[PDB]
Amino acid sequence: TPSFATVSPQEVSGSSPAEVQNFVQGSWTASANWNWIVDPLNGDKFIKVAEVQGTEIKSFMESLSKCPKHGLHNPLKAPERYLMYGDISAKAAHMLGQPTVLDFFAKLIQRVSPKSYQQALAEVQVSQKFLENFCGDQVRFLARSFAVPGNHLGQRSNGYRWPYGPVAIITPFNFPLEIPLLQLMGALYMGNKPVLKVDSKVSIVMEQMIRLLHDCGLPAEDMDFINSDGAVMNKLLLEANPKMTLFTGSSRVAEKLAADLKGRVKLEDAGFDWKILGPDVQEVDYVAWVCDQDAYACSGQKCSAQSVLFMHKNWSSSGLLEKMKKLSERRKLEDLTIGPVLTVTTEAMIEHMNNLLKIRGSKVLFGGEPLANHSIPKIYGAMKPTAVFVPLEEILKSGNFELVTKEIFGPFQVVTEYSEDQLELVLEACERMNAHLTAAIVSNDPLFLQDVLGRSVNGTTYAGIRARTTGAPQNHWFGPAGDPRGAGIGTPEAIKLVWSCHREIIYDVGPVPESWALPSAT
Amino acid sequence: TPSFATVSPQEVSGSSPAEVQNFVQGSWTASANWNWIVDPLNGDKFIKVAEVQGTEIKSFMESLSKCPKHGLHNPLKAPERYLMYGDISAKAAHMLGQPTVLDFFAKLIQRVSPKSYQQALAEVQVSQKFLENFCGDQVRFLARSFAVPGNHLGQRSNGYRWPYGPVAIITPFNFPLEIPLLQLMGALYMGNKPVLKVDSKVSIVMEQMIRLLHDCGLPAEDMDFINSDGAVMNKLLLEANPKMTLFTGSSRVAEKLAADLKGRVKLEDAGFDWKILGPDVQEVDYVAWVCDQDAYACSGQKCSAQSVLFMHKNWSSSGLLEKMKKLSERRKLEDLTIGPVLTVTTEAMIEHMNNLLKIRGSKVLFGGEPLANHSIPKIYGAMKPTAVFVPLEEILKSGNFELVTKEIFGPFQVVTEYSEDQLELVLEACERMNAHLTAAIVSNDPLFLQDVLGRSVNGTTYAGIRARTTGAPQNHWFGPAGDPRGAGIGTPEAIKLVWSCHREIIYDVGPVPESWALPSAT
Amino acid sequence: TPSFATVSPQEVSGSSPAEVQNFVQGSWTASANWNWIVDPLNGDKFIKVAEVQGTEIKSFMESLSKCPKHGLHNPLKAPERYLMYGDISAKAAHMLGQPTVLDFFAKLIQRVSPKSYQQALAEVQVSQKFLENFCGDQVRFLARSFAVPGNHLGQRSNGYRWPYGPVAIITPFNFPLEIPLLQLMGALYMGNKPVLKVDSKVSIVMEQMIRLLHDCGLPAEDMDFINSDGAVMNKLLLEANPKMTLFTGSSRVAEKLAADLKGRVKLEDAGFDWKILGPDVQEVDYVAWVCDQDAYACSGQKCSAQSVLFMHKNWSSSGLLEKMKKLSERRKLEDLTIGPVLTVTTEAMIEHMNNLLKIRGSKVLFGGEPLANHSIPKIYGAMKPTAVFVPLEEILKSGNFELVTKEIFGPFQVVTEYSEDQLELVLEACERMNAHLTAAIVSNDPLFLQDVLGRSVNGTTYAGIRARTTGAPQNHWFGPAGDPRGAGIGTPEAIKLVWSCHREIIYDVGPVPESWALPSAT
């Protein structure tokens, strides 16, 4: 295991448990009481987390209050800190790129947020590439400003990206590294001081990542790391009053926080993501593979996962559904191509399936049964990949729509069919949804693509015969649309939008014209 | 006729000839060295152009020398001039938008650069809309700068768009208003002082437009306007040493000036513009219409005109050629849908056709005969719209290729056919051309489009079943690619590229650090 | 020495000579005859260079002709090559950052282009940081394009950065690594295939750098490396007809090439760089140190070196000149804070000094004598740091001006004085210069700064009490202004301006309106 590590991903078990600590006011620290996380594969108490209680959050308040509203740095103050984070990112990117460190983080991710080794590796690879994008001067370049000449000699107006100062970051279980690391660095790049909270089930990953970052030069005083339940984190937000809060998680918590913080938030909330198949049937094998990966990689536990499939009638005879069935059935627990579902129980998923089956014309296409021969504790779901057909005309009906468009954060999707005359019904269904995260339009017809795109919203939409719903890398935006609170992640634009605000500084140095005379009052 | 005007477009004739003067050092000249321009439709000496002679360029040299290399203004000097040119632009845009003024310029363009009323009107409309793009603060916004934080407190680097100062603009006969106006305003916008030369055959249009610009507030000392033959203008360029020269015209003169001026030029030179038809045959009527307009509007006297058509074999049975033939034959002199060819004689075009007809397998598809019942002087061509088919495999042979790809600035195009297995031969043909101005790829197949687009160069390429080669408006770039001297026109980027250069200003105001001691010498 | 190295910088001597080879068509190759470079410190034949003759350049022509005008890659073709160069740059940046590799290149630079160890190290550090700026997706991001909606459904216009294809790079002796490496990578990033020529006196450095780059994944076929005299390189340019040529060197060769190539060039030519001291005297020690480093680091062999100093009269009593004298006299050969002058002999520098001393009121302030106790061959100069005062009023006179503003690529500067009433004379002198590279305005008075800046041109101007003329790093532009051929180096903007051109691609896919009917011809 690497030098910075305090845990061995393959060793940690009920008999060799690991602990996760907080970091506040520059040092690693425990708490009054520990909480046990169980191994999602067997129920072992294998990680204890130093969860802070509601009356031991003063140190985090005090640490945040040390950051003024003009930031740890800004384009005019301590600019050498932009260069430092270029260097930190370079050292960290080189560390994350080491095969043994890649494997360490991929394995650690697997133990807490169960997914296949390649899916866990992809999280580290995205993280590594993101850090490579902000080496050298590239953090400095995030603080690029513009200027425009004024109305007279000596006047020129400037637009800067100003930090917010004390901020908070809250991220969920399913991506224990990629989401928190990318928002953490973005916040630091623009000059904020963040407090980072990761779901206690998986926070061990970012804890190890923070130790690496400290070894790469991240200053002890620049950030804090808190482990707690949601209720304590809520109290800290209302007591510390951070100037910006990045929240990534369920839509229920996002709206509650948006109300509590009175909109001083950026949100990456839930998504009910759709894939539309166009009329031009082709590359059936490739499209089927993407459908299986979109819907069922990580057992569907992606905010970008394919939750509904609108099949054009031309695809009904293609063999696509048959290939999707076969592809779902080679997924298995032993390599975690199917696995524990950390936020939906098996009963909840079965009940949802049965509720859908009450609808006229509906039928299970494949799956619909629990996994067998496993030791997954009953708090976590264990389902075979499931797809349920529901006729399009029934979906559009009231009551049925809210049920059909309900997000199941597990390996579960709804499939439906539309004829050449029914594209409006499909677009009506997409417009009636409450979430606009990812989407895919599988067609190469430019008239079909531009029609669907122009009459849709989703903030990360893929278009083309190779279109997918999942796997947004760091080279382009990922985030919802249709919401002024919508957060992005990864790109320079996402960092600047989420972690800075506009400040206009207008210079007006003179000279006062020699012919100037006191005008009449106005 | 409008207030600013000194000529009536419908009344100028041999019995009532018009005078065109020069503008230098803030005054309209009174030169008597008339160059008599003949009416392209009947041969009347209907315009006397006061052309500057050898010794008379000293006034223009002196006027340009009054502008320093830091411009009439720049982002830090006399910035109120940016606002002034927004106001001039708004006033000129409103004047050009007046129906009687639109008509006046359309009809005047017709008299000197014979083309249909709608084509002439389109030139005024592009000019009017371009001026609308630079009202208010939009000239100010052209001088937008960027800045980056430095390595320490008090250091910040700035990137500005600096003028060149004294500059020159030379434009051809075919667009008497759009080209000179758009480059003139672009030069003035960025802080330069231009001398403008329009081809004497058509310079009456800019003369009137300059009078309009003066009525809208263009300062008398901000630009000069010279009429001369090419040899006199060449002498002025070598004597005045302008820091930038925008030249639009023939490739031969372009390369001569680029050598003479040692590359202190931006060029819009000739173009041998091509259209490729893809395999997906559709909208035959529309595609035939666009082909007819691309090739023969203004009798082909557009630098963007369609000079060769690569037909996919699938199009050979579509009726496309038959429709092109019918469409060409409704062009007539009465509305100037066919007309005088100001730079290529009838005999020259017939000779070129007969040279192409020596090649094996070639044929006249339509046209190939002079126009009848007209009084166009013999110095100007008068040809029916002409298309010569040449087999693709013959086109690619050496000797043939140079003849086939010779630009005929008249109503003439080459037509060829390629089978599904010969796209490489078409692309080799386009790559062996020396000019890369406009192009069209008539296809909605995205795999074909990206393949041809990825393996071509032309700076203004249209793609889609509605793709054309002509008619680039002010909302997007027009100009060649593949040349560091390539000029753009119309857009904010084109203006900044052609009429400004980068200047970096790095502020380093201190404080001299507490820790600073005199470092050892390096 | 590092693994990629074929030379030991500290070992190479007359008795242990090194050789420099060409790289063409994917392999290291010699030539018919070798030319010997002498050690600038003692005259030893210590490096033999495989200089190609005029009749052995066919392989370089053939290698360049393999690159089409649509590049080795472009935004639509082989885009994975953008990612590859992100990876290559990351591997190279990590290699250059290794202390032993830094020291290797710093020492090798010192042997061929003599300068202090810290100055040579600064070249490697700039190179290392530049490569760090283009890791991950940052090369991909250089190919960022924009788009604007069209006039109707299905129409949208796009502006891309297109490569030129086969290009050439020519760089001088004084920066054997920084200049060629940064332009080489810039050319490759945008999709060009360059042939790189470095002054044979120092080309050993880039030869070692290319071996490192090959170890980091630079494809064998992506670039060529030619060693030759200027005359052979001239023939190659006219025979291979590269689509773009980056030239950095003397103003004489730059203008000749700009004429031969008819302006298909970008130039980083000579500079006569000025420093103006404002009226507000302060930080005299700091200002003196910067004056000594600007004028005399590398013995003045920087295109950015301080060649003239306009002293405001307020500074005459500050002790500045006295400190400048003392600072110049602690420079010595043994640590190369003074040293060989590779392109100006001692006699030439003495003669220039004596020519200046013929001017009334002129006097040597310090220096003016050759170095002693050295073995520098007489082809190279060996002068003590020299500053000559010339009264401002005499400078402005004809004849005197051309002599005073003559660039001496050695440790030599002119000092003059201006009173509070004479700022116009200083600005007149700056406007009358023929080169506008670097400049410094040493003042914190914003009215003085904006007045001088607004009435000057130089493309890399520093302003503030800490203003300098030398040492432009990779985080901001370096390059001249006032020239459409002006090149930049280092920054993303510099790379895009120098190594790509605009291509506009306008999509127009339909639909053709159902109500469309063939309009009358225009």
C486 touches chain B (CB under 8 A): yes
Instruction: Test A140 with B152 for CB contact under 8 angstroms.
Output: no
A443 touches chain C (CB under 8 A): no
Half-sphere exposure of A137 (CA within 13 A, CB side): 23
Instruction: Test B146 with A151 for CB contact under 8 angstroms.
Output: no
Picking from A108, A116, A42, A142, the residue whose alpha carbon sits closest to that of residue A497 is A142
B157 touches chain A (CB under 8 A): no
B509 touches chain A (CB under 8 A): no
Best residue in B80, B84, B138 to probe A by mutation, most A CBs within 10 Å?
B80
Backbone φ and ψ for A384, nearest 5 degrees, come out as: -70, 150
Q: Is B434 labelled as part of a ligand binding site?
A: no
Backbone φ and ψ for C75, nearest 5 degrees, come out as: -55, -15
Best residue in B87, B151, B155, B449 to probe A by mutation, most A CBs within 10 Å?
B151
Distances C27 to A304, B299, C92, C222, C236 between C-alpha atoms, Å = 48, 54, 20, 11, 19
Set C135, C298, C303, C430: catalytic member = C303
- For residue A355, the Cα-to-chain-centroid distance in whole angstroms is 29
Instruction: Assess contact for C36 and C171: CB atoms under 8 A.
Output: no
Residue A284 C-alpha, separation from nearest chain B C-alpha, in angstroms: 17
Phi-psi map region of A71: left, alpha, beta (phi>0 left; psi -120 to 50 alpha): left
**Closest residue, chain C, to A128 (C-alpha):** C136
Backbone φ and ψ for C111, nearest 5 degrees, come out as: -70, -30
Instruction: Test A155 with B80 for CB contact under 8 angstroms.
Output: no
Tokens 């591997």 sit on residue: C91
DSSP sequence for B68-131: -TT-S-BTTB-THHHHHHHHHHHHHHHHHTSHHHHHHHHHHHHHHS---HHHHHHHHHHHHHHH
For residue C103, what is the DSSP state?
H
Q: Is C197 labelled as part of a ligand binding site?
A: yes
Which of A79, A141, A147 minimises the CB distance to B152? A79
- What is the pairing mode between strands C244-248 and C166-171? parallel
Residue B394 annotated among the catalytic residues of the structure: no
How far apart CA A255 and CA A248 sit, in angstroms, is 11
Instruction: Test C133 with A130 for CB contact under 8 angstroms.
Output: no
State the burial class of residue C335 (Cβ atoms within 10 Å of its Cβ: 0-12, 13-18, 19+): middle
**Closest residue, chain B, to C463 (C-alpha):** B507
Instruction: Assess contact for A292 and A299: CB atoms under 8 A.
Output: no
Interacting residues of B374 by C-beta distance below 8 A, sequence separation 6+: B41, B333, B382
Residue C128 C-alpha, separation from nearest chain A C-alpha, in angstroms: 9
Q: In what order do the strands lie in the sheet with C155-162?
A: B363-366, B386-389, B412-418, B306-312, B273-277, B438-442, B460-463, C501-508, C155-162, C146-149
Q: Where are the alpha helices (DSSP H) in B249-306?
A: 251-260, 284-296
Instruction: Test A79 with B444 for CB contact under 8 angstroms.
Output: no
Instruction: Give A507-513 contacts, CB < 8 A, sequence gap 24+.
Output: A507/A150, A507/A154, A507/A155, A507/A156, A507/A157, A507/A158, A507/C446, A508/A150, A508/A154, A508/A155, A509/A154, A509/A155, A509/C446, A509/C447, A509/C450, A510/A153, A510/A154, A510/C446, A510/C447, A511/A153, A511/A154, A511/C447
How far apart CA B120 and CA C60 sit, in angstroms, is 50
Instruction: Test B147 with A147 for CB contact under 8 angstroms.
Output: yes
Residue B49 β-bridge partners: B20, B35
Segments forming the whole domain that contains residue C391: 273-464
Tokens 């044979």 sit on residue: C200
Interacting residues of A239 by C-beta distance below 8 A, sequence separation 6+: A57, A61
Instruction: Test C518 with B285 for CB contact under 8 angstroms.
Output: yes
Tokens of C58: 């066919």
Picking from C405, C381, C445, the residue whose alpha carbon sits closest to that of residue C309 is C405
How far apart CA C38 and CA C21 sit, in angstroms, is 17
Instruction: Assess contact for A170 and A248: CB atoms under 8 A.
Output: yes
Residue B168 β-bridge partners: B195, B245
Beta carbon pairs, A and C, within 8 Å? 71
For residue A166, what is the DSSP state?
E
Q: What is the largest CA-CA distance in chain A?
A: 92
Instruction: Assess contact for B291 and C482: CB atoms under 8 A.
Output: no
Q: Is A250 labelled as part of a ligand binding site?
A: yes
Residue B489 C-alpha, separation from nearest chain A C-alpha, in angstroms: 23
**Closest residue, chain C, to A473 (C-alpha):** C137
Interacting residues of B301 by C-beta distance below 8 A, sequence separation 6+: B113, B115, B174, B341, B342, B343, B409, B410
Instruction: Assess contact for C401 and C235: CB atoms under 8 A.
Output: no
How far apart CA B457 and CA B445 sit, in angstroms, is 19
Residue C153 C-alpha, separation from nearest chain A C-alpha, in angstroms: 8
Instruction: Assess contact for C338 and C366: CB atoms under 8 A.
Output: no
DSSP sequence for B151-214: SSTTEEEEEEEE--SEEEEEE-SS-TTHHHHHHHHHHHHTT-EEEEEE-TTTTHHHHHHHHHHH
**Closest residue, chain B, to A507 (C-alpha):** B76
SS3 for C366?
strand
Backbone φ and ψ for C41, nearest 5 degrees, come out as: -95, -20
Best residue in B246, B262, B294 to probe C by mutation, most C CBs within 10 Å?
B262
Distances B132 to B94, B128, B137, C439 between C-alpha atoms, Å = 8, 6, 12, 39
SS3 for B240?
helix
Distances A385 to A304, A521, C427 between C-alpha atoms, Å = 16, 76, 77
Interacting residues of C398 by C-beta distance below 8 A, sequence separation 6+: none
Instruction: Assess contact for C512 and B465: CB atoms under 8 A.
Output: yes
Residue B244 C-alpha, separation from nearest chain C C-alpha, in angstroms: 7
Instruction: Test C157 with B475 for CB contact under 8 angstroms.
Output: yes
- What is the pairing mode between strands A27-29 and A22-24? antiparallel
Picking from A39, A33, A34, the residue whose alpha carbon sits closest to that of residue A15 is A39
How far apart CA B472 and CA B494 sit, in angstroms, is 13
Which of C74, C243, C477 minimises the CB distance to B504? C477
| Total H helices, total E strands in chain A | 17, 20
Residue A443 C-alpha, separation from nearest chain B C-alpha, in angstroms: 11
Instruction: Test A135 with C130 for CB contact under 8 angstroms.
Output: no
How far apart CA C420 and CA C314 sit, in angstroms, is 8
Which of B76, B80, B445 minimises the CB distance to A151? B80
Distances A182 to A126, A198, A483, A489 between C-alpha atoms, Å = 9, 13, 21, 7
How far apart CA A8 and CA A347 sit, in angstroms, is 34
- What is the pairing mode between strands A244-248 and A265-268? parallel
- What is the pairing mode between strands B386-389 and B244-248? unpaired
The residue count for chain A? 522
Best residue in A84, A133, A445 to probe C by mutation, most C CBs within 10 Å?
A133
Q: Where are the alpha helices (DSSP H) in C261-366?
A: 284-296, 320-329, 346-357
Could you give the residue numbers annotated as active site of A? 268, 303
- For residue B454, the Cα-to-chain-centroid distance in whole angstroms is 25
Residue B504 C-alpha, separation from nearest chain C C-alpha, in angstroms: 5
B426 touches chain C (CB under 8 A): no
Dihedral (Cα; B110, B116, B119, B124), 10-degree rounding: 30
Instruction: Test C136 with A133 for CB contact under 8 angstroms.
Output: yes
Instruction: Test C474 with A136 for CB contact under 8 angstroms.
Output: yes
How far apart CA B300 and CA B303 sit, in angstroms, is 8
Distances B29 to A11, B22, B32 between C-alpha atoms, Å = 94, 5, 9
Per-window interface: A 75-104 vs B, CB < 8 A:
75-80, 82-83
Indicate the residue type of B517.
A
SS3 for B223?
coil
DSSP sequence for C176-208: TTHHHHHHHHHHHHTT-EEEEEE-TTTTHHHHH
B140 touches chain A (CB under 8 A): yes
Q: Is B42 labelled as part of a ligand binding site?
A: no
**CATH, residue B391:** 3.40.309.10
C129 touches chain A (CB under 8 A): yes
Residue B360 C-alpha, separation from nearest chain C C-alpha, in angstroms: 30
| Total H helices, total E strands in chain B | 17, 20
Peptide bond into A172 cis (omega under 30): no
SS3 for C41?
coil
Tokens of C500: 């790509």
Instruction: Test A145 with B140 for CB contact under 8 angstroms.
Output: no
**Closest residue, chain B, to A508 (C-alpha):** B76
**If DSSP states are collapsed to H, E and C, what string results for A452-490?**
HHHCCCCCEEEECCCCCCCCCCCCCCECCCCCCCECCEC
Residue A161 β-bridge partners: A502
C284 touches chain B (CB under 8 A): no
SS3 for B315?
helix
**If DSSP states are collapsed to H, E and C, what string results for A420-439?**
CCCHHHHHHHHHHCCCCCEE
Distances A354 to A347, A358, A365, A384, C190 between C-alpha atoms, Å = 10, 7, 13, 15, 56
Instruction: Assess contact for B244 and B167: CB atoms under 8 A.
Output: yes
- For residue C348, the Cα-to-chain-centroid distance in whole angstroms is 24
Which of C137, C154, C510 minimises the CB distance to A129? C137
Instruction: Test B145 with A148 for CB contact under 8 angstroms.
Output: yes
Indicate the residue type of B211.
R
Distances C364 to C307, C385, C414, C416 between C-alpha atoms, Å = 15, 11, 9, 12
DSSP sequence for A240-299: H--SEEEEES-HHHHHHHHHHTTT-EEEE----EEEEE-S----HHHHHHHHHHHHHGGG
Interacting residues of C93 by C-beta distance below 8 A, sequence separation 6+: A90, A135, A136, C128, C129, C131, C132, C135
Burial B375-384 (b: 16+ CB within 10 A, else e): ebbeebbbbb
Dihedral (Cα; A392, A394, A400, A404), 10-degree rounding: -20
Dihedral (Cα; C290, C292, C293, C296), 10-degree rounding: 150
C255 touches chain B (CB under 8 A): yes
How far apart CA A102 and CA A118 sit, in angstroms, is 11
A156 touches chain B (CB under 8 A): yes
Angle at B278 between CA B274 and CA B282, to 5 degrees: 115
Residue B303 annotated among the catalytic residues of the structure: yes
Instruction: Test A146 with B146 for CB contact under 8 angstroms.
Output: yes
C68 touches chain B (CB under 8 A): yes
